[PDB]
Amino acid sequence: ATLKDITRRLKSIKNIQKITKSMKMVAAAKYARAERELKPARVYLCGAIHSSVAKQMKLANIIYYSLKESTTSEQSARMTAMDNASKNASEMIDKLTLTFNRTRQAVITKELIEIISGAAAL
Amino acid sequence: AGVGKTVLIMELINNVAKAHGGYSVFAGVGERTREGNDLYHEMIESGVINLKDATSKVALVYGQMNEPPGARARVALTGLTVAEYFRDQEGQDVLLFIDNIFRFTQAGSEVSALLGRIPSAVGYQPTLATDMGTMQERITTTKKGSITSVQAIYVPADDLTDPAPATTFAHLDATTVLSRAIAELGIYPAVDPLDSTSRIMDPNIVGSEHYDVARGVQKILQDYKSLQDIIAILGMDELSEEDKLTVSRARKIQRFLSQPFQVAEVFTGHLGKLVPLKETIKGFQQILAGEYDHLPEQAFYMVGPIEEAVAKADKLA
Amino acid sequence: AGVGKTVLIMELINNVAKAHGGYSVFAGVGERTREGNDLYHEMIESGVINLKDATSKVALVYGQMNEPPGARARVALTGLTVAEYFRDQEGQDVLLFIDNIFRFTQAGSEVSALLGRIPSAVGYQPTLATDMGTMQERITTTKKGSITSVQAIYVPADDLTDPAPATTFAHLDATTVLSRAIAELGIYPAVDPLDSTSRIMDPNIVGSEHYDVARGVQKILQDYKSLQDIIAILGMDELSEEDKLTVSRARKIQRFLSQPFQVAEVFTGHLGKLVPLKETIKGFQQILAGEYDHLPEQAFYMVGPIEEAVAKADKLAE
Amino acid sequence: AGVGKTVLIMELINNVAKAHGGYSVFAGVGERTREGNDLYHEMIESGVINLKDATSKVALVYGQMNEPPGARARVALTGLTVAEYFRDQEGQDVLLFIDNIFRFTQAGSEVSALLGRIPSAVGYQPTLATDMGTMQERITTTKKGSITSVQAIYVPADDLTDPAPATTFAHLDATTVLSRAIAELGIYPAVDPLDSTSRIMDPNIVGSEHYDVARGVQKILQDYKSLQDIIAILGMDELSEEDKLTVSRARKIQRFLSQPFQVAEVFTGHLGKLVPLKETIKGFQQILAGEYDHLPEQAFYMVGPIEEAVAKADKLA
Amino acid sequence: YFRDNGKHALIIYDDLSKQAVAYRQMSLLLRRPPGREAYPGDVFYLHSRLLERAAKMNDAFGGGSLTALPVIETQAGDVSAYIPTNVISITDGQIFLETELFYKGIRPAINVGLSVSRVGSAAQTRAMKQVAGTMKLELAQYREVAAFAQFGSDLDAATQQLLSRGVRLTELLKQGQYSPMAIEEQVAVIYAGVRGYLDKLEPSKITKFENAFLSHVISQHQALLGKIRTDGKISEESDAKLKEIVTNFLAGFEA
Amino acid sequence: YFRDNGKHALIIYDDLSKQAVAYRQMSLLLRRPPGREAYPGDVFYLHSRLLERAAKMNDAFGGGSLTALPVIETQAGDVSAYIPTNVISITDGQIFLETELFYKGIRPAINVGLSVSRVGSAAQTRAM
Amino acid sequence: YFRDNGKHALIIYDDLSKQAVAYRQMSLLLRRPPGREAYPGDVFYLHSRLLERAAKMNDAFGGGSLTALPVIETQAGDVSAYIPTNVISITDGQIFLETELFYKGIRPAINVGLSVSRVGSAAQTRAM
Ligand SMILES: Nc1ncnc2c1ncn2[C@@H]1O[C@H](COP(=O)(O)OP(=O)(O)O)[C@@H](O)[C@H]1O
Ligand SMILES: Nc1ncnc2c1ncn2[C@@H]1O[C@H](COP(=O)(O)OP(=O)(O)O)[C@@H](O)[C@H]1O
Ligand SMILES: [Mg+2]
Ligand SMILES: [Mg+2]
């Protein structure tokens, strides 16, 4: 890993941390507005949840009952999946920012010791 | 730059002279000539320098950027000497400002290089730590007095681990971080109350009460910061009666941390306050109990003691 | 190393030097001897060099990779001397090709220590920039006559910030920057559309249509560049309708930038195409407007004019 | 530093030397003296050293972290010469255990500096590799007799491209590269499965059953490796039904590539294990085939043969 | 000479980088001990001493002034390299130009969020300082949300407005080469975007509008501009005329 | 003195990192070819010869002991740098301290998962 | 000898990475100031001299040929490295191998994007 490699990786992951942080909010607005509307209906990339019902698979009165149990489950899980993705990206920023500084320092030292070798040998 | 650095320096001088009868020295280590002149005239203005008589509380030692590395590596030493007379002859508590410490290291690095010495890690001088040590070790409490130093820290490539900052942090007993976000949100002085820490912040040194109160303030502001995510996007009308208490209490504490300075008198209009240690501790301790739970938020902003928080909460009938 | 410099200088000779009314000078400076013999016999066949009569139009100078540094440090000065006379004591139109001009810097730095100098940064001789200065400033159009100079520049360790190439930029009116990242995808020529500049990229000079389409291409390619790393993790579908449309167009523009060369036939398997100016501007104008968003991207890969891309898409029906 | 070179070499001594007919030499090069005292007394207690008899099986040569550089620069040659005799002038079989051979190269830098040469890269001696050569080429099997050498190689700052370790690869028939990152996952021995090679890994020498399984394991471990960027951000929840499967298998294989050592019993408390080659193949053959897809990962962690993992799944309530 | 004799000068060093390289050549060939990047320990002393000669004189010494615009070429965005690090530390401020900005459309390619003037406010005319302050805060707020512009359809009311204001002002900051504007001409066009007149106009049309709008106010409203300059800010009278010129022009534009 | 005359001593080197920099200063003023972080080839030897003198003697030599607790200050958890990896590969174990744990209020701030002291296990009381 | 006598020879240099190291040593001991990465300023000339001697001869010189396959060892799969790019810049192309491809089953582990032939189809039969 060089500085070019790292700063490129840093900026992109810093961006993934941003989009994911806003998608945490968007899902939180959709989740709350859906959990407030499961109450009267009670008595009548979102992670594993899209596979959970698709793997378990392998009129008008009940069709609605499930369709408001879905949005509470989905916009909730998306809030959870994305709360992770941004926090994982945050940990990856903190880690890569540290690698970048070590590497910056090392390179400066290296490139300087090479100049010194050439001057003393004369 | 931007946040009230100079004002804080000019206030420290003014406040230390009034409370502890000690003078101040300011050392400009590779300072820009434009910013040097600007400080001179700004210091005349705030009254810490008097052209007419002899009430000036600061001395000025200047080593401008356009001077050879020798000159700029010695200016911290010229200022240290002036500061030392006030401690070792008049028995005062001297306040020494170095602006800034990186340029002291920078200058040493160059002298070294010019002397043919082999550079060290990251291009610094091999005498880096001793260059620092020989200078930084004269700034101490003797039995005849003390020199206390506030040094401006520049961090290269925003890297704390960089040899220049890294070395300095060995001699540091406190950090005062002037925050950017806190300045535009009105709060002055713009001191970040969570980045700023102290070594003498320990119950055995400053008393059990001083420790317990300020650790309570820190806890309340730290708990406030985490609650902000639940507040900003979800909604305030969710949290229980025990959480609403902590939100308003901490917000009132934030306001009480702001202060009208004596040097910012001919700029903001408000009168400047110098709050003693006892009144500082008791006020924040009182807010933590719930004694001022009834009072409005905008009372503690820009006041002296907690008594001025009463007069301002009355004037808004 | 190995991204297309020579192939490109070869195609330009094919496209410009063959037509050119006047004299040309080719300097082989510290490159492959094989290439020189390849060049010699291609020019004899095409007639640009005639051994029998005296209607010859090219002068050749060679000091290749098999020579000691001193020969390599000077052959560039020999070439441009042949080019200097034709500029002044003939006053005519002169073309000057140098492959590779890096090998005059490298050479100079091969003997620097044995000359008693402390090395400057990255190993180079402390006189890098002035050696360059006193050499390059001779390669120029004066009032006495004209020189069109094409110079291949090797970029050591694939680093454009390397003293040698970095100091070469200031000596140039137009820059074509090849890229390995682009070559490894199969895009030839691997010109970087976001790092190649020219002094006459100005509406006042090339017209507003030429300039607006040009900047339009770069704009979409920069947009797609800044989505690249984000869409790879978050998935394609999470993109808005405006974006996944600039992704399709930019990817198609990316391929329409690639072109088969009359000289690279032994590499591509494709008959070389040369696309005139007005057919280029209009073609790219069209992809940007949206006129080909129903075509598969592989229609635009390795073709000539925009008409050929439609023909290719038609053939991909079966 | 601290990955398990010495624990590896001690387990190897226990597992190969005791059960071979012939002599062994141990050279201690630039290492811990206490480790020498540890080895000596434990060899006395087991009876491979006999202070009264003539049946001693091991020659010891030591030149450790306390010796001048010259001494450490040559110790490797001394233990080597002891091993040279036993190979030739007996018509016999020798084992040679050196720990640590890096210190030879390292000791070369120290004297090279005072010999006043122009250093090569990283500060190292310009003679680095010829030094290493004239030394390494004597540690070899000949027509006259064989040396099985197991040398421990220290890696400066985990950089396998550092001249010292980088040049050592050319001199080996097998490389067991230990990985810090693997150790932090709690996997021992921390052998890097995708970075460890042997010249005997040939379908004509080990047979195709051994070759096909080995290669197949390296394939699934490589495929998992490129899946670890996507996981690192989004998690395993954003994976296909195909990729999820290779991951579960690769994680089961990663852990089954770990086993407790006899020389580790002292601190683990768990009995050490010795797995016959045919059982290692059968075990990994089965995980790949898909025969243990219902079992959990943690069932493959720190066991011997594949049977023991099956029994560990029952044990998990 | 100008600074000293009551006059005002502006010097451009293009560039100081090559001057440094040149000094390194001499330093090394004189066997002076090499340092970081092969530069001698007094390469800072070389630039620092030059750039501190630029100054604003008081009335007693003539009242003159010298302003320096030094140019530094970074290598792959490395502002931390020796010489960049030096001259950055000497100057009173920096204008950062960036490649990905340049090709995205932003020309000139100034990174508004990173560039600084420590002198700043104390050298703008009262009129500029009014619209500039509003633009500063509106763009900064924009920069926070900019990432969720292309990845957000379920945006709330308050942020959707911020994005729109942002891209608008961003376009207003774009400018052609070899066509500098008078300070009043400048505030006039920023005024349009700042007061939200271009909020409904399509972002791809802002360049066409500004060119036509500016051409118009220069043609007919020579007095309105003269007021913005002389009045020493945007007056109540000036606020009214602008509100009318824009609205009617804007309707006429979109027809 | 205590080690050899039947007694037991404990030495604390606070810290060995700063001794390394002093020695780097010495080595660079002496013009000795720098390696990683400009340290001279023999920084390892500098600490190894020292830290080896801490030992437990048998009864035949008085039964004494010297115990060494050398301190190494890392930058931002970089227990992978030159001087840290040297001292690790010289001493018998490590007590690891993290900024992370200190802040939370785990005081003392020991990582009890990374820390090791394999030779101290035999020398632990049965009660413990 | 084969090349100049109407015969056809193929030479393999395994590997030119090590010869450069030998050259580096030889140069530094001859007290010739180090250049880039500690190698002599002329490491390019070292290999350029040698590989330019691999050639195809016309019929007046006997029609012979010497073909060369130099071997270079990369560090951590980095072809963009200074020494690798020096040799790549001499030869008529490169076969590039990657440990990642090797372990995935792609054997030979040829990276197609990064490997090229500079003679191309001219070196193939019509059938190929
Ligand atoms: N195979 C193993 N099983 C369990 N722990 C191990 C094993 N190998 C190494 N370790 C851990 O690593 C530590 C260091 O071991 P050691 O071999 O002395 O490191 P080094 O590679 O420097 O020789 C041990 O104290 C132990 O905690
Ligand atoms: N224009 C192109 N079209 C197809 N293939 C190309 C093209 N340019 C280069 N190549 C391929 O890549 C190789 C490298 O090109 P070359 O000009 O020899 O590189 P350089 O001179 O920059 O070192 C060529 O041998 C050829 O196979
Ligand atoms: Mg070429
Ligand atoms: Mg060990």
- Structure tokens belonging to residue B268: 């903001």
In terms of DSSP bridges, do strands F93-94 and F116-117 run parallel, antiparallel, or are they unpaired? antiparallel
**Phi/psi at F18 (nearest 5 deg)?**
-75, -30
Find the closest chain A residue to F77 by CA distance: A98
Out of D6, D7, D155, give the residue to mutate to test ligand 1, the one with the largest number of ligand atoms within 8 Å of its CB: D7
Q: What are phi and psi of C259, to 5 degrees?
A: -155, 135
A/C Cβ contact: 3+ pairs below 8 Å:
yes
Question: Is G29 in contact with D117 (Cβ distance < 8 A)?
Answer: yes
* F71, F97, F109 from F112: Cα distances, Å: 18, 9, 9
- Pull the structure tokens for residue D250: 């690769």
Q: For residue E199, what is the DSSP state?
A: S
Ligand 3 center from residue G72 Cα (angstroms): 20
- The candidate with the shortest Cα–Cα distance to B118, out of C307, A119, D12, is A119
CA of E29 to the centre of ligand 1 (A): 54
Tell me: do C63 and C120 sit in the same domain.
yes
Q: Which residues contact D306 (CB under 8 A, 6 or more apart)?
A: D256, D279, D282, D283, D286, D287, D292
Residues of chain D with Cβ-Cβ distance to C233 below 8 Å are: 229-230, 233-234
Q: What's the burial of B252, exposed, middle or buried (CB within 10 Å: 0-12/13-18/19+)?
A: buried
The whole-angstrom separation of Cα A22 and Cα E42 is 49
Contact E185, E172 (CB under 8 A): no
Neighbouring residues of A3: CB distance < 8 A, sequence distance ≥ 6: A100, A103, A104, A107, E78
Which listed ligand is nearest to C64 at the C-alpha? 3
D145 is in an annotated binding site: no
- Say if residue D169 is in the same domain as residue D81: yes
Burial class (CB in 10 A: 0-12, 13-18, 19+), E176: exposed
- Based on the domain organization, do B314 and B182 belong to the same domain? no
Residue E10 DSSP symbol: E
Chain D CB within 8 Å of residue G61 CB: no
Residues with Cβ within 8 Å of D106's Cβ and at least 6 positions away in sequence, in order, are D30, D72, D164, F41, F44
Only one residue has tokens 């804080």, namely B8
Ligand number nearest CA of C261 is 2
Within 8 A of D219 by CB-CB distance, chain G residues are: 103-105
C246 is in an annotated binding site: no
Structural domain harbouring B307: 201-317
Distance from CA of D171 to the nearest CA of G (A): 13
Question: Which tokens hold the place of D171?
Answer: 């001199």
Residue of the nearest CA to atom 11 in ligand 1?
Answer: D4
Rg of chain C taking only CA atoms, in angstroms: 22
Q: Residue B287: what residue type?
A: I
Whether residue D124 is found in the same domain as residue D263: no
Tokens of B113: 């290089």
Find all residues with CB under 8 Å of F47, minimum gap 6, and list them. F16, F20, F70, F83, F86, F87, F90
Residue numbers after which chain C is interrupted (C to N above 2.5 A) read none
Phi-psi region of A102 (alpha: psi -120 to 50; beta: other; left: phi over 0): alpha
User: How is B192-245 classified by DSSP, letter by letter?
Assistant: -TTT-EESS-SHHHH-HHHHHHHHHHHHHHHHHHHHHHIIIII-STTS-HHHHH
Query: How far is the centre of ligand 2, averaged over its atoms, from the C-alpha of C104 (Å)?
Result: 22
- Chains with at least 3 CB pairs less than 8 angstroms from chain B: A, E, F
Ligand 4 midpoint to CA D5 (Å)? 6
Ligand nearest to the Cα of C99, by number = 3
- C57, C109 Cβ separation under 8 angstroms: no
> In sequence order, which ranges of D169-207 are alpha helices (DSSP H)?
180-184
Report the chain D residue with the minimal C-alpha distance to residue A106: D122
* Residue C95 identity: L
Q: What span, in angstroms and rounded, lies between the C-alpha atoms of B132 and B122?
A: 16
Fold type of domain E125-255: Lysin (1.20.150)
User: Is residue C278 domain-shared with residue C215, that is, in the same domain?
Assistant: yes
DSSP state of A42: S
- Among residues B27, G37, E66, which one has the least CA distance to residue D161? G37
Q: Are D264 and D157 members of one domain?
A: no
Verify whether residue F3 is a known catalytic residue: no
B60 in Cβ contact with B40 (< 8 Å):
yes
Considering every ligand atom, which ligand is closest to the CA of C5?
2
- The domain total for chain D is 2
Q: Report whether C165 contacts C153 (CB < 8 A).
A: yes
Q: Whose CA is nearest to atom 24 of ligand 2?
A: G118
The neighbour count for residue D54, using CB atoms within 10 Å, is 5
Find all residues with CB under 8 Å of B63, minimum gap 6, and list them.
B27, B28, B29, B30, B31, B71, B72, B74, B75, B78
Q: Which tokens in the block code for residue B161?
A: 């681990």
- The CA-atom distances, in angstroms, between E54 and each of B28, B63, C263, F90 are 19, 18, 57, 58
C-alpha span between E8 and E232 (Å, rounded): 22
State how far residue F13 is from chain A, nearest Cα, in angstroms.
Answer: 26
Residue B267 CB-density burial (10 A; 0-12 exposed, 13-18 middle, 19+ buried) = exposed
Mutate: best of A103, A117, A122, partner G, most G CBs <10 A: A117
Beta carbons within 8 Å of F112's beta carbon, 6+ residues apart: none
- The span from the CA of C56 to the CA of C59, in Å, is 8
Place of tokens 């050569």: D133
Query: Which residues, in sequence order, are CB contacts of F127 under 8 Å at separation 6+?
Result: none
For chain G, first and last CA: distance in Å? Answer: 31
- C-alpha radius of gyration, chain B, whole number: 22
For residue A41, give how far its alpha carbon lies from the nearest alpha carbon of chain C (Å). 30
- DSSP H helical segments within chain A, as ranges? 3-35, 49-55, 60-120
D7 has binding-site annotation? yes
3-state DSSP of B33-81: HHHHHHHHHHHHHHCCCCCCCCCCCEEEEEEECCCCHHHHHHHHHHHHH
* Claim to verify: residue B182 and residue B65 sit in the same structural domain: yes
Give CA separation, C107 vs C76, C112, F31, in Å.
Answer: 11, 9, 31
Cα A91 to the chain's mean position, in Å?
10
Q: Do A121 and G35 touch (CB under 8 A)?
A: no
Task: Name the closest residue on chain A to residue C236, using Cα atoms.
Answer: A45
The gap from C-alpha D13 to its chain's centroid, in whole angstroms, comes to: 11
Q: Which of D2, D30, D113 sits opposite F32 (nearest CB)?
A: D113
**How far apart (Å, rounded) are the C-alpha atoms in residues B251 and B197?**
20
User: D45: domain CATH number?
Assistant: 3.40.50.300
Q: Could you give the C-alpha distances from E59 to E5, E7, E41, in angstroms and in order?
A: 11, 12, 38
Q: In chain D, which residues touch G (CB < 8 A)?
A: 117-121, 126-130, 161, 166, 170, 194, 215, 218-219, 221-223, 226
Residue D63 assigned ligand-binding role: no
CA distance C150 to E87: 35
Cβ atoms C210, C34 nearer than 8 A: no
Give the active site residue among B5, B138, B251, B312: B5
Q: Please return the burial class of A103, using the count of CB atoms within 10 Å of its CB with bins 0-12, 13-18 and 19+.
A: middle
C-alpha closest to that of B73 among E24, E39, E44? E44
Extract the annotated binding site of F for Mg(2+).
Answer: 14
List b or e across G9-35, with b for residues whose CB sees 16 or more CB atoms inside 10 angstroms. eeeebeebbbbbbebbbebbeeebbbb
How far is the C-alpha of C143 from the C-alpha of C84, rounded, in Å?
13
CA distances (Å), origin B56, targets B43, B83, B148, C235, E11: 9, 15, 19, 67, 39
- The pairing of strands D58-63 and D23-29 is parallel
Same domain assignment for residues C183 and C49: yes
Coil, helix or strand for E230?
A: helix
Distance CA A33, CA F113 (A): 44
C-proximal residues of E, 181-240, CB under 8 Å: none
Residue keyed to tokens 């806890």: B219
Write the CB contacts of F72 (distance below 8 Å, at least 6 apart in sequence): F15, F16, F17, F83, F84, F87
Tokens of B206: 């400053």
**Sequence ranges of the binding site of F:** 14
Asked if C129 and E22 come within 8 Å (Cβ–Cβ), the reply is yes
CA-closest candidate to residue D58, choices D36, D73, D77, D74: D36
**G100 with D118: Cβ contact below 8 A:** no
Distance between CA atoms of residues G45 and G58, nearest Å: 26
The partner residues of E94 in beta bridges, in order of sequence, read: E116
Distance CA E53, CA E47 (A): 10
The verdict on A89 touching E (C-beta cutoff 8 Å) is: no
Domain boundary among D140, D174, D200: D200
Q: Please give the positions of D annotated as active site.
A: 5, 31-32
**Do G and B have ≥3 inter-chain CB pairs under 8 A?**
no
CB spacing of D123 vs F35 below 8 angstroms? yes
Of D296, D312, D294, D289, nearest in space to D217 by CA: D289
Taking contacts as CB-CB distances below 8 angstroms, the residues of chain C near G36 are 122-123
Q: Measure E7 CA to nearest chain A CA, in Å.
A: 45
Q: Which of B200, B222, B246 is the last residue of a domain?
A: B200
Distance CA B195, CA E245 (A): 51
Inter-chain contact A120–D238, Cβ cutoff 8 Å?
no
| Cα(B176)–Cα(C254) distance, integer angstroms | 52
Supply the Cα-derived Rg of chain E in whole angstroms: 23
User: Distance of CA A88 to CAs A92, B233, D235, Å?
Assistant: 6, 21, 9
Q: Which run of H or E residues covers position F19?
A: helix F16-29
Distances (CA, A) of F96 to D17, D187, E236: 36, 20, 68
| Alpha carbons F20 and F26: distance in angstroms, whole number | 10
Up-side HSE of residue E16: CA atoms within 13 Å toward CB? Answer: 26
Q: Please name the member of G33, G36, G37 whose beta carbon is closest to the beta carbon of A121.
A: G33
Distance from CA of G119 to the nearest CA of D (A): 33
Same domain assignment for residues D213 and D86: no
Question: In the beta sheet, which residues pair with residue D105?
Answer: none
Do D154 and D223 share a domain, yes or no?
no
Residues B177 and B82 in one domain: yes
What backbone phi and psi angles, to 5 degrees, belong to D170?
-55, -25
Burial class (CB within 10 angstroms; exposed 0-12, middle 13-18, buried 19+) of E142: buried
The alpha carbon of C8 and the centre of ligand 3 are apart by a number of angstroms equal to 9
DSSP per-residue codes, C18-34: TT-SSEEEEEEESS-HH
D42 with D116, same domain: the answer is: yes
Inter-residue contact E45 to E32 (CB < 8 Å) = no
A67's tokens: 């369709």
Q: Which residues pair with C62 in a beta bridge?
A: C28
CATH number of D308's domain: 1.10.1140.10
> Phi and psi (nearest 5°) for B60?
-120, 120
| Contacts for C20 with CB less than 8 Å, ≥ 6 apart | C57, C93, C95
Query: What's the angle, vertex CA D263, arms to CA D260 and CA D264, rounded to 5?
Result: 45
Backbone phi and psi for residue C95, each to the nearest 5 degrees, phi listed first: -95, 140
Q: Would you call F78 and A102 a contact, using CB atoms and an 8 Å cutoff?
A: yes
Question: By CA distance, what is F32's nearest residue in B?
Answer: B118
Beta bridge partners of B198: B174
Angle at CA G20, nearest 5°, toward G19 and G22? 60
Resolution in A: 2.8
Question: Measured between alpha carbons, how far is E124 from E127 in angstroms, rounded to an integer?
Answer: 8
d(CA A8, CA B127) in angstroms, rounded, equals 36
Vertex B172 angle, CA B167 and B177, to 5°? 105
Structure determined via: X-ray
Cβ separation F38–B121 shorter than 8 A:
yes
Size of interface A-E (CB pairs under 8 A): 31
Task: Give the separation between CA B174 and CA F20, rounded to whole angstroms.
Answer: 26
**Subunits close to D (at least 3 CB pairs below 8 A):** A, C, F, G
Taking CB atoms and an 8 Å limit, are D120 and G24 in contact across chains?
Answer: yes
Give start and end residues of each alpha helix (H) in chain D: 5-12, 33-46, 69-88, 102-114, 128-136, 163-168, 180-184, 208-226, 228-234, 243-256, 265-268, 277-289, 306-315
Q: Which ranges in G9-115 belong to alpha helices (H)?
A: 16-29, 43-51, 82-88, 99-104
